[PDB]
């Protein structure tokens, strides 16, 4: 079956791992255990088709970032995640999107902007239109707000990337 290489990017503590393991294992990771290096693979069914998904979960907090360029070179689709409870994580994404375009050398790369922790509405410091308005600037890229905890739009992040790659 066909393989899809996805990379989950974003700053520390935004929920990259929580979204990933909720997607592959249906487990909610409550603890904050900073990632060093982790890759997951799971056979799924997207639009009546069985396919292999490779998901590289990156370290939001690392000292050496030389490998990021290589992860971007080999990935087919990218999920840029921020947390709606921390403004700096949202601000940090513009650099990641610019770096990806630079490495792929095209403005048309499968991508989805994800605002995680949407279940913490009372703690929101990044508005939804603020998030939607950033995605429109990035050539109208996909955008959604999720929650690894409540299971809101978790599967959607990954299926959408598979769908953009299929076009």
């Amino acid at each position: 079956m066909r393989e899809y290489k996805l990379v989950v990017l974003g700053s520390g503590g935004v929920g990259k791992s929580a979204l990933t393991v909720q997607f592959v294992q249906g487990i909610f990771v409550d603890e904050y255990d900073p990632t060093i290096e982790d890759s997951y693979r799971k056979q799924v069914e997207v639009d009546c088709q069985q396919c292999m998904l490779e998901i590289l979960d990156t370290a939001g907090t690392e000292q050496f970032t030389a490998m990021r360029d290589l992860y971007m070179k080999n990935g087919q689709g990218f999920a840029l995640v921020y947390s709606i409870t921390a403004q700096s994580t949202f601000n940090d994404l513009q650099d990641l999107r610019e770096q990806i375009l630079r490495v792929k050398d095209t403005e048309d790369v499968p991508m989805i902007l994800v605002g995680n922790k949407c279940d913490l509405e009372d703690e929101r410091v990044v508005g939804k239109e603020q998030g939607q308005n950033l995605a429109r600037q990035w050539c109208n890229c996909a955008f959604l707000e999720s929650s690894a905890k409540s299971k809101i739009n978790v599967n959607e992040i990954f299926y959408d990337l598979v769908r953009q790659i299929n076009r």
């Binding site: 294992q25 487990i27 990771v29 060093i36 890759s39 693979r41 490779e54």
Partner: protein, 76 residues
């Protein structure tokens, strides 16, 4: 204080080793989130000196003794 582990289905993880952990304790969470059960797998130490050989390890091995070693988990 880490160990890189190659897992089945072309997966990989780098785990932190806290003094006192057995090989089973440090890989527990990484295996669980991928639905892998240690009792159905063998774990090896990759021998780089002997071009491609692996040397099987006990799941109860002291993990701190393996810092710097690259490992491989396979199914039985």
């Amino acid at each position: 204080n880490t160990i890189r582990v190659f897992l089945p289905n072309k997966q990989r993880t780098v785990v932190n080793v806290r003094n006192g952990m057995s090989l089973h304790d440090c890989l527990m969470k990484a295996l669980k989130v991928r639905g892998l059960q240690p009792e159905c797998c063998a774990v090896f130490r990759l021998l780089h000196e002997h071009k491609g050989k692996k040397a099987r390890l006990d799941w109860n091995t002291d993990a701190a003794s393996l810092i710097g070693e690259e490992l491989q988990v396979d199914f039985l």
